[PDB]
Amino acid sequence: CSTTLIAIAGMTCASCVHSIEGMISQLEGVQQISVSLAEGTATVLYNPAVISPEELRAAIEDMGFEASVVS
Amino acid sequence: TCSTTLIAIAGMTCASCVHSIEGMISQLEGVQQISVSLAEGTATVLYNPAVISPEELRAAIEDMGFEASVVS
Ligand SMILES: [Ca+2]
């Protein structure tokens, strides 16, 4: 319903991007996620009634990557 | 004598990569030791400067997929 761009630092293998996508995509309200390793971003399609970019960033950071919401 | 160089390494996020970097870089000719700090995002390398340069070490670390810069 909404889309957010999140900068994620230190994504340096495929396995981590899949972990990130796997974990984030399974959160309630998260419809879709695509990570770009080249950009260092995750684009997330989410339901703002349920989840926010700030909580997505927090979830990425609980996985151990520095993150910040871009837009 | 051997020289010491400090290399900042961006994007180390796991113990496994640390071990990989140390394992591969240590094998390079002229590299006595390398101590990677996951905490500080750096590597200290004790190396023979007649055999290998900091720029060569930086490049080798970058070939492993981490952005690296020689600091000191
Ligand atoms: Ca070590």
Author numbering:
A (entry chain A): 2 to 72
B (entry chain B): 1 to 72
What do the authors report?
P-type ATPases, including ATP7A and ATP7B, are responsible for active copper efflux that is essential for maintaining copper homeostasis in mammalian cells. These two proteins are also known as Menkes (MNK) and Wilson (WLN) disease proteins, since dysfunction of ATP7A and ATP7B leads to these diseases, respectively. ATPases contain six metal-binding domains (MBDs) that share high sequence homology with Atox1, a chaperone delivering copper to ATPase, and exhibit similar copper-binding properties.
Since copper was not observed in the crystal structure of the TM-WLN4 complex, this indicates that the reaction with TM expelled copper ions from Cu-WLN4, suggesting the dimerization of WLN4 does not require copper ions. To verify this assumption, we reacted apo-WLN4 with TM, and tested whether TM can react with apo-WLN4 to generate the same protein dimer. Structural comparison showed that the overall dimeric structure of TM-WLN4 obtained from apo-WLN4 is identical to that from Cu-WLN4. These results further indicate that copper ions are not required for TM-mediated dimerization of WLN4. These results indicate that formation of the copper-free Mo2S6O2 core plays a pivotal role in the formation of the dimeric TM-WLN4 adduct, which is rather different from the reaction of the copper chaperone Atx1 that generates a copper-linked TM-Cu-Atx1 ternary adduct. In addition, this Mo-centered copper-free adduct could be more relevant in the case of WLN since ATPases in the cytoplasm exist in apo-form, and copper-bound ATPases are localized at the cell membrane.
